[PDB]
Every structure is written in C-alpha cells, then in structure tokens.
Amino acid sequence: TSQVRQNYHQDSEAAINRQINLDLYASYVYLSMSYYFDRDDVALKNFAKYFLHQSHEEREHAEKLMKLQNQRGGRIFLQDIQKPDCDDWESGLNAMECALHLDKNVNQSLLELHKLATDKNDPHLCDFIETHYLNEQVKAIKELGDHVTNLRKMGAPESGLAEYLFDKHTLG
C-alpha cells in the first residue's frame, strides 16, 4: 500500500487503468483518421489537421490519468493499444460519424467511471472526472454533431465539392 494512498478503492484504480487504455486507443483512432485524409487520393488537409489535433488531445487525457493514478497511490498497468477498426475511413462525413460514435463510447466509459467513484464515495475522483473530462466530452460530441449535420446538409459524402468546401470553411 502506497504511503499516499487514501480513500482510493481497488476498483477505481483498475477502472482508471482501463480508461487510460481507452484514451490511448481513441488517440490511435484519430491518428489513423488524420493520415487517411493526408492520402493523395483523399487530400483534405484540414480534415487531416482536425483529427491529428483530436489524437494529441486524447493522448493528453491519457497522460493526465496516468498522473492521477500516481497522485492517488495507484499503480499504472498498461495494455496493448488496439489497432482501429478501419484502415480506410471512406469520406469526411464517414470519419466524422465514426468520431462521434467514438466520443460517445468514451463518454459512456467516463460516466461509468464517475458512477463507480460515486459508489465508492471518492469525491476527489468524482471532481477530477467532472473537472477535466465530462464537459470536455460534451463539447466534443456537440462539435462532432454540428460537423456531421453540416456535411449532410451540404450533400456529403456524394458531393466531393461539399467535403472540399467544408474542409476550407469550417475546418480551415
């Protein structure tokens, strides 16, 4: 038992390790998406930039959890970071839809983590999740929803013009 450990349940420690992996996985998905848009036969530089930014953001979230783990006297246990489900992401719209799905899954995990912290009467962990993650996640989801709506209304994915103009005017 760590000399710093206090009011930190074994289950919370484990759930934090799972959340670290999930955040790294989400970083990897966004990395994959980014470089798809960098392909010469896709060539949407601002979609590429957008998802690369998301990738780095997820990695930062992971690192903050690793810091939290140590702050509470828990022990970090890393797992394989799974390759994303797709190598080819189809279109800007499809990638945005996939990102929305991903962010809602990450949000579900955050909510379960918060439920667990609540059940274990760990107000420090509840506060940590609220402070750093819950509103961040709601904002991300809202933004992805907004992007999906605009792309659909513009005529994506069939309109390559729509995805081109969205790349310039929203993502650029």
Find the binding residues for Ca ion in span 19-58 (CB under 5 A): 54, 57
Find the binding residues for a second copy in span 98-127 (CB under 8 A): 100, 104, 107-108, 111, 114-115, 118, 121, 123-124, 126-127
DSSP structural state of residue 171:
-
- Residue 143 or 155: which CB sits closer to Ca ion? 143
**Could you tell me the smallest distance in angstroms from the CB atom of residue 94 to a second copy?**
14
Using alpha carbons, select from 133, 14, 132 the residue that is nearest to residue 72. 14
Q: Torsion angle, CA of 85/91/92/98, rounded to 10 degrees?
A: -30
Residue 168 binds which one of a second copy, Ca ion, none, with CB within 5 to 8 A depending on kind? a second copy
Using alpha carbons, select from 164, 143, 144, 140 the residue that is nearest to residue 154. 164
- Residue 18 or 35: which CB sits closer to a second copy? 35
d(CA 1, CA 5): 7
Q: Which residues contribute to the site for Ca ion (CB under 5 A)?
A: 54, 57, 80, 130, 140
